[PDB]
From Swiss-Prot:
It is found in: Nucleus; Chromosome. Scaffold subunit of various histone acetyltransferase (HAT) complexes, such as the MOZ/MORF and HBO1 complexes, that acts as a regulator of hematopoiesis. Plays a key role in HBO1 complex by directing KAT7/HBO1 specificity towards histone H3 'Lys-14' acetylation (H3K14ac), thereby promoting erythroid differentiation. This is Bromodomain-containing protein 1. Highly expressed in testis. Component of some HBO1 complex composed of KAT7/HBO1, MEAF6, ING4 and BRD1/BRPF2. Component of the MOZ/MORF complex composed at least of ING5, KAT6A, KAT6B, MEAF6 and one of BRPF1, BRD1/BRPF2 and BRPF3. Interacts (via PHD-type zinc finger domain) with unmodified histone H3. Interacts (via PWWP domain) with dimethylated and trimethylated 'Lys-79' on histone H3. The lineage of its organism: Eukaryota, Metazoa, Chordata, Craniata, Vertebrata. There is a cross-link at K41 (Glycyl lysine isopeptide (Lys-Gly) (interchain with G-Cter in SUMO2)). Residues 9-113 form the Bromo domain.
Length: 121
């Protein structure tokens, strides 16, 4: 239908907007601590600790299959990345601190992205 096509045009342009947002987000992770899923080879008990793993590679796969229907969903996964890290790793570690910095630098990007999503509808 025309209705379905228009629906998919918005989804596509959402996806274009999210791909940008996701790049700005990785750019704030120069150490690439969150680029890839935590290796179960190197940390074999990880899933005993973290129930829902997330990372940028995984988010990017979902994104390219247009699996993000709105910004709430995308933010949910981004927060998973941060919250998992600040749980699994202790306060005085390089990993925890990298997450706190991503959280803070990221929040700016998501503050404006939320406005662009509303207005562009
Ligand atoms: C995003 C995130 O939580 N990263 C974690 C992955 C595990 N490393 C520690 C590590 C490295 C190598 C071997 C055994 C443990 C850093 C913390
Ligand atoms: Na902890």
């Amino acid at each position: 239908s025309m209705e379905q096509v228009a629906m998919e045009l918005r989804l596509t342009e959402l996806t274009r907007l999210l791909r940008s947002v996701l790049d700005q987000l990785q750019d704030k992770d120069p150490a690439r601590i969150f680029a890839q899923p935590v290796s179960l080879k190197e940390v074999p008990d990880y899933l005993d600790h973290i129930k829902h793993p997330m990372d940028f590679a995984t988010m990017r796969k979902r994104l390219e299959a247009q699996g993000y229907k709105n910004l709430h969903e995308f933010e949910e996964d981004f927060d998973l990345i941060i919250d998992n890290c600040m749980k699994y790793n202790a306060r005085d570690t390089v990993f925890y601190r990298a997450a706190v910095r991503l959280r803070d630098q990221g929040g700016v990007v998501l503050r404006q992205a939320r406005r662009e999503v509303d207005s562009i509808g």
